[PDB]
Design a protein around this nucleic acid. Structure first.
Ligand SMILES: [Mg+2]
Ligand SMILES: [Zn+2]
Lengths: 515, 139, 417
RNA sequence: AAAUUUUACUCACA
RNA sequence: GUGAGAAAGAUUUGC
């Protein structure tokens, strides 16, 4: 059906591929490709362009944001049981906590400052030295990236050591800052459509547009290129340490460690590679492995190809193409004048995951489509009604609900089929506020979040410290007694107020109800 | 022995960020194993029962949107709307009234939202989420 | 105690008074304000609170007693400390950004930089690759797509029946007949019965791929939504026949046979065999008590079943139909047939896209979008993007790929661009 | 048996 | 069904 669309369509209405296949095959294939590129027989991994144009940021203070350093996502923690290396799959929060415990440091910033100011690699930092940290940070674990549309064979992603993440955070923050300084398109607060519009504005002068993608992007970005870029932007010893760790990286496939001296292991340094391309020229607008350029004559095309080769951005002959009336960047397709190309485009369907999450996500998707002009409002109204009917058919049974209140949705035993316009205008029962894209979280979302918090990798017996005073910074050091006092005082105040738990706060509702 | 000395072995003080990250239960991930999780132990049914009788009769009634203007289809553009965060005194008051501290802190930060919009009005005014085609204005 | 914070403490307290006239904070770096004859536990002393205050940078603790109040000067133009007043007073007082020597910078050169650089030098380096030759030609025409489709047809052929696609059409059986047929089929196959549910026991695996061919398209798929909902429900709860308004299916957990201590309950990694009923007239026929039906089985891992069952058939069809061109009639093999073809077979194709967990149709759709938007493509390389047989494995994915290519061919034939 | 290295673990307690 | 241990358990699967 996607083939018989008047406009453009990527066939995104269904979910991406998935399976329970082990990640051994994909990781092995990626490592083999990296080795082949290293031998210099398949693609180019040697950087030749000049990066002197990039500004130097060596005098900037060393800043670390703890928000991205602690997360519920997976990571690899290395321990030495008796005399061998054991790689354990934990959460990034747990890995960072273990790293700080072994190094005996209050915060990651203290750890990085101590690491950068030791006399020798053998000097001790708590229970470990810099040499041990570098040895442990080169170990990676493999996993499968499923649900990636257009890739029937799922790719291999890699979980890294906490120290590797700690250094990569600084490197990528500074690389992103340098990118934002290089051009106005890489601004932090910019959407995909805004980037596409700027791209259209940039290539209006020329006639032909080359929409290009890079093949084996991660396997062709050597540690040498990363070190070159980092030195160009002035990363000091952090860049050297990261390059050394990347060059000696080992991947644990099943139960064996495989050495992968080439590549950068599936997009660890997207900003750094984007800089590797952008510092050699200004004729490209690239985002990692996807770019668009413009030209008038075959000589300009040859120059573009030479520039791409020099920057280790190997053109994908399978996907890259040339157009005259189209512009594809960040998956977004625009006409040469900057207007959105007619058709479904990147519109993605909403799978059935929760009676109310499905409705909320459908509302968000329909709002996005209607605002952009993809479809008219009445079509969105009809689609929302149909989705409500389908949710009722799928979830209206004793397993999920036992209520019959009229105001409830038909999928929760009710008899209300809310209009899309009525929902978007907040002209409905308060129970429907959670279904609004800007409204509170739904019941299913909270239930799933709690259940996830109860998972094996994330379960903890620590006394939860939630509902804190806004005036207390999150960098403040606390002990067990301190957290006990804070919780006791907050619980006493709440009991005085008569509330057993804090009342959920929504910014939109609070701002609307205000006079 | 307390959990503090085991999770943070060798350290007597840790940042609030780390402690909070160790106990996080407010992040939602859309995953394949959603219907099975909701069915298990009738968790969603129990949560709906609890919400309908303890949490629902606390949400304030939000007035519906009224203002709208004539709009016409136009070239795609980016609408930037700056939603400011709560003031210090406002946050202190809301905390004192028993509102969840985490949500107030999150709302403390000023933020800007960029959305693609393909409709324009005569006076070039902003529109609400998803209502640009109908002309509802932020005002 | 350090001399680098002398200026920092001086500007911290200029004219701040605690009771009526006396300065609240006294700098320890100035003898006039310093208290003689007492130990110094910090760079400032608060008479009102009677405590010591020590200033330190991010990640550089100083040697002071724990009782001393510590103020952290963050590098992002913000400050952190214990007392609210100190945090607020520091923020307003230090509104002017003054650099304090001793702050580590990103470009800091460690004492081991030379050693690490030498070690990197001694490590292997890549070799320059060959310069590719690129020739830009027109995108492939109808002949190339026809050639790819014919290659697939010759290589794999066709099955005699649509195995599980036929389950999209109602069988001529009622609820009780369907349940009886499914239960007796389970009994015939020697499935173990336990706790009122059916389990399939396996011991040895041939460890070779199952035969792959192309499924012919049934006439229509009226029971697509019901089939997907039933698949979801059954793979969520298995062992017993689950019924819909017009059809029913049986999800059987597949478990290893280990003797006495063999597994009794399925886990999150246990696969399922989904058994469905369709009209008789194929090699998979089954009869019992005068009831005849074709029984077809699909082996799915839990993720595959979850992916299949969560798709929305009706919404997807409507969204596609919003801005779709006229769909031509097609035959059982996907070939254009304006005489005996049926336009409902397209729905079947959509159902196939829902039943294929590899979603190769999405890859074909992306490549076709590139084809339609392209003016010139690389020679002998853009065509290879349509050869995805090596990427997938199985009957359902193969059929989905074949019919996606057939849809591309039909679009190029009926509505050329 | 099938979309075929996948459909598999141990202990304590209830 | 809960806890702990296997390079490991379903928020799995990273930037
Ligand atoms: Mg591209
Ligand atoms: Zn058959």
């Amino acid at each position: 059906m996607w083939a018989f669309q008047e406009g453009v369509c990527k066939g995104n209405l269904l979910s991406g591929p998935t399976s329970m296949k082990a990640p051994d095959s994909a990781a092995r294939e990626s490592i083999d490709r990296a080795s082949e590129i290293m031998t210099g027989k398949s693609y180019n991994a040697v950087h030749t362009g000049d990066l002197s144009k990039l500004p130097n940021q060596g005098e900037s203070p060393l800043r670390i944001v703890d928000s991205d350093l602690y997360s519920e996502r997976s990571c690899c923690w290395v321990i030495e049981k008796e005399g061998r290396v054991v790689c354990k799959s934990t959460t990034l929060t747990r890995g960072m906590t273990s790293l700080l415990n072994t190094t005996k440091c209050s915060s990651p910033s203290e750890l990085i400052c101590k690491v950068l100011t030791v006399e020798s690699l053998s000097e001790k930092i708590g229970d470990t030295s810099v040499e041990e940290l570098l040895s442990h940070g080169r170990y990676f674990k493999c996993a499968l990236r499923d649900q990636e549309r257009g890739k029937p064979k799922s790719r291999a992603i890699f979980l890294s050591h906490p120290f590797f993440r700690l250094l990569s955070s600084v490197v990528e923050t500074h690389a992103r800052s340098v990118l934002s300084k290089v051009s106005a398109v890489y601004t932090a607060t910019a959407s995909a459509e805004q980037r596409a519009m700027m791209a259209a504005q940039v290539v209006e002068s020329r006639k032909h547009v080359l929409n290009g993608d890079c093949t084996k992007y991660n396997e062709a970005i050597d540690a040498d290129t990363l070190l070159k870029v980092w030195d160009a932007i002035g990363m000091g010893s952090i860049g050297v340490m990261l390059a050394y760790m990347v060059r000696r990286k080992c991947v644990l496939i099943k139960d064996t460690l495989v050495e992968c001296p080439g590549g950068m292991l599936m997009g660890m340094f997207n900003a750094t590679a984007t800089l590797a391309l952008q510092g050699t020229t200004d004729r490209f607008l690239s985002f990692s492995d996807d770019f668009i350029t413009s030209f008038n004559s075959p000589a300009e095309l040859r120059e573009i190809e030479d520039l791409l080769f020099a920057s280790c951005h190997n053109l994908s002959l399978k996907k890259s193409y040339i157009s005259v009336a189209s512009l594809e960047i960040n998956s977004c397709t625009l006409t040469r004048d900057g207007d959105l190309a007619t058709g479904l485009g990147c519109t993605a369907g909403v799978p059935f995951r929760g009676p109310l999450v499905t409705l909320k996500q459908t509302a968000a998707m329909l709002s996005g489509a209607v605002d952009s002009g993809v479809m008219p409002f009445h079509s969105a109204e009809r689609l929302f009604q149909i989705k409500q009917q389908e949710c009722a058919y799928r979830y209206n049974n004793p397993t999920y609900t036992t209520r019959n209140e009229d105001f409830l949705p038909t999928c929760l035993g009710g008899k209300t089929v809310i209009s899309f316009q009525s929902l978007l205008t907040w002209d409905c029962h308060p129970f429907w506020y959670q279904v609004h894209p800007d409204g509170p979280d739904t019941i299913d979302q909270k239930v799933l979040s709690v259940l996830a918090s109860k998972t094996r990798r994330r379960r903890t017996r620590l006394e939860a410290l939630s509902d804190l005073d806004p005036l207390v910074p999150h960098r403040l050091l606390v002990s067990e007694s301190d957290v006990s006092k804070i919780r006791a005082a907050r619980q006493a105040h709440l009991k005085s107020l008569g509330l057993e738990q804090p009342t959920n706060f929504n910014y939109a509702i609070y701002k609307a109800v205000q006079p | 022995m307390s959990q503090f000395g085991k999770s943070f072995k060798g350290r007597t003080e840790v940042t609030i960020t780390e402690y909070r990250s160790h106990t996080v239960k407010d992040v939602h991930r859309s995953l394949l194993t959603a219907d099975k999780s909701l069915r298990k132990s009738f968790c969603f049914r129990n949560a709906l029962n609890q919400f309908l009788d303890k949490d629902l009769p606390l949400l304030p009634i939000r007035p519906k949107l009224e203002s709208r203007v004539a709009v016409k289809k136009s070239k795609l553009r980016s609408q930037l709307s700056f939603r400011p965060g709560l003031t210090q005194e406002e946050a202190i008051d809301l905390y004192n009234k028993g509102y969840d501290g985490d949500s107030v802190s999150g709302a403390l930060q000023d933020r800007v939202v960029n959305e693609p919009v393909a409709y324009s009005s005569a006076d070039n005014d902003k529109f609400h989420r998803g209502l640009a085609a109908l002309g509802y204005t932020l005002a | 105690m350090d001399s680098r914070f002398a200026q920092l403490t001086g500007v911290f307290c200029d004219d701040f008074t605690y009771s009526e006239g006396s300065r609240r904070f006294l700098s320890s770096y100035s003898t006039v304000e310093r208290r003689p004859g007492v130990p110094v536990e910090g760079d400032c002393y608060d008479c009102l609170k009677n405590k010591w205050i020590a200033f330190e940078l991010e990640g550089q603790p100083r040697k002071f007693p724990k009782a001393t109040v510590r103020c952290i000067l963050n590098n992002d133009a913000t400050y952190v400390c214990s007392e609210q007043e100190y945090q607020q007073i520091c923020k307003v007082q230090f509104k002017d950004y003054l650099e304090i020597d001793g702050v580590v910078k990103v470009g800091h050169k460690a004492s081991y930089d030379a050693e690490l650089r030498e070690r990197l030098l001694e490590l292997p380096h890549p070799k320059s690759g060959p310069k590719p030759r690129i020739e830009w030609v027109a995108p492939p025409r109808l002949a190339d797509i026809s050639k790819e489709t014919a290659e697939l047809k010759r290589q794999y052929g066709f099955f005699e029946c649509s195995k599980f696609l036929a389950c999209g059409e109602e069988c001529g059986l009622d609820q009780e007949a369907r349940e009886l047929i499914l239960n007796e089929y389970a009994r015939d196959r020697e499935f173990e019965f336990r706790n009122g549910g059916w389990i399939q026991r396996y011991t040895v695996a041939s460890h070779k791929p199952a035969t792959q061919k192309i499924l012919p398209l049934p006439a229509s798929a009226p029971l697509a939504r019901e089939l997907l909902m039933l698949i979801a429900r059954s793979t969520t709860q298995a062992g017993k026949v689950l019924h819909s308004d017009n059809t029913s299916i049986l999800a059987v957990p597949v478990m290893r046979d280990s003797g006495k201590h063999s597994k009794r309950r399925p886990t999150a990694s246990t696969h399922h065999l989904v058994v469905g009923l369709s009209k008789p007239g194929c090699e998979h026929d089954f009869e019992f008590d005068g009831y005849r039906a074709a029984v077809h089985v699909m082996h799915l891992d839990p993720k595959q079943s979850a992916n299949i069952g969560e798709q929305d058939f009706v919404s997807t069809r409507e969204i596609y139909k919003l801005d779709m061109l006229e769909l031509p009639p097609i035959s059982r093999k996907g070939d254009l047939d304006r005489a005996s073809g049926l336009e409902t077979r397209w729905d079947v194709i959509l159902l196939l896209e829902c039943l294929d967990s590899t979603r190769v149709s999405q890859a074909v759709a992306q490549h076709f979008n590139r084809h339609r938007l392209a003016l010139s493509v690389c020679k002998d390389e853009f065509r290879k993007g349509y050869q995805l047989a090596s990427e997938i494995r199985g009957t359902i994915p193969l059929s989905s790929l074949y019919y996606s290519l057939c849809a591309v061919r039909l679009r190029m034939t009926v509505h050329p661009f």
